[PDB]
Amino acid sequence: KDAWEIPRESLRLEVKLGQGCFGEVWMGTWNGTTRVAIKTLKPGTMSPEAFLQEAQVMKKLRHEKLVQLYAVVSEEPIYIVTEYMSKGCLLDFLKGEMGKYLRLPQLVDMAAQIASGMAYVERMNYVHRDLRAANILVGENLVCKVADFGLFPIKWTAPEAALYGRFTIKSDVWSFGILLTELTTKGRVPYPGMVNREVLDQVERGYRMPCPPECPESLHDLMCQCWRKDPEERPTFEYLQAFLEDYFTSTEPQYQPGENL
Numbered sequence: 303k304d305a306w307e308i309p310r311e312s313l314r315l316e317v318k319l320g321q322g323c324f325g326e327v328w329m330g331t332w333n334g335t336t337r338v339a340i341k342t343l344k345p346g347t348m349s350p351e352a353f354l355q356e357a358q359v360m361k362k363l364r365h366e367k368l369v370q371l372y373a374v375v376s377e378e379p380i381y382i383v384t385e386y387m388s389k390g391c392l393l394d395f396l397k398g399e400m401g402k403y404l405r406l407p408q409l410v411d412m413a414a415q416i417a418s419g420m421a422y423v424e425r426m427n428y429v430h431r432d433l434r435a436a437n438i439l440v441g442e443n444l445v446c447k448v449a450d451f452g453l454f455p456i457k458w459t460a461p462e463a464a465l466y467g468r469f470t471i472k473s474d475v476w477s478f479g480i481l482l483t484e485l486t487t488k489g490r491v492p493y494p495g496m497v498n499r500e501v502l503d504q505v506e507r508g509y510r511m512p513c514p515p516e517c518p519e520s521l522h523d524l525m526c527q528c529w530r531k532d533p534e535e536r537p538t539f540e541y542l543q544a545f546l547e548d549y550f551t552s553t554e555p556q557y558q559p560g561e562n563l
């Protein structure tokens with residue numbers, strides 16, 4: 303065994319956080335005083351090999367804005383242990399009590415962190431496949447990090463990805479565009495009123511969501527750039543990041559606080 307492997311009694315599973323039928327996720331403590339999130343396998347549901355294929359991927363991906371692997375126990379019972387992101391998922395964070403105080407400058411900063419996480423994925427030649435607010439984790443002081451809860455999200459998926467299976471970093475770009483509409487509507491589901499097949503049909507014909515209320519036209523323009531038909535036309539995460547980091551100087555220097563944004 304290797305560097306990640308830790309003894310089982312060095313963990314304390316304190317609070318149940320979530321359960322699917324492939325296992326559980328707990329908030330916990332590792333050795334002394336180290337808050338951790340601990341993921342569990344429900345025995346019988348998937349291959350011990352296949353469950354630990356997740357931490358096999360997280361060992362090779364290290365960056366400030368992707369959730370970080372801490373430890374691995376690799377005989378049953380097995381556990382994957384990461385840093386604790388204390389405020390939960392970005393979708394819940396936008397919708398809940400705390401979603402009503404977020405204004406355009408906190409939201410654009412959030413998008414810039416995620417672009418940064420995604421710029422690193424982009425430089426690593428990796429592909430997310432499921433970039434959306436449900437898979438972004440939030441910590442203290444509005445820190446965001448890219449994650450994957452490992453669950454059909456046609457509403458967040460590019461036409462070439464949904465129809466023909468061509469998932470690339472260019473399809474994660476399209477979803478980032480969709481993630482942007484999530485931030486600007488406080489977590490609302492994209493294409494309001496529309497069902498999957500009506501979405502898949504309207505979009506092929508050239509439909510793209512309109513500027514959300516109070517959101518600046520220049521930010522809708524970036525979503526629209528992320529939603530080009532031709533995957534290669536779509537911008538780079540290095541571009542998306544720098545454009546969001548620089549936003550209130552280069553692009554909307556006369557921005558003024560509103561009711562929701």
Ligand SMILES: CC(C)(C)c1cc(NC(=O)Nc2cccc3ccccc23)n(-c2cccc(N)c2)n1
Binds near residue numbers: 322325388390
């Ligand atoms: C199905 C599966 C993978 C066991 C699961 C687990 C969770 N929930 C979480 O993992 N929640 C949390 C993870 C990490 C830190 C958290 C901090 C505070 C509250 C929840 C957290 N899930 C979840 C539940 C509800 C919404 C979202 N976005 C994710 N889903």
Ligand SMILES: CC(C)(C)c1cc(NC(=O)Nc2cccc3ccccc23)n(-c2cccc(N)c2)n1
Binds near residue numbers: 363368382449
């Ligand atoms: C590409 C990237 C963003 C570095 C990533 C991260 C993960 N894994 C996770 O995010 N796992 C977890 C998500 C949410 C809560 C967790 C709590 C404890 C342990 C892992 C968690 N990934 C992953 C890889 C392979 C399979 C699965 N399901 C997930 N991928």
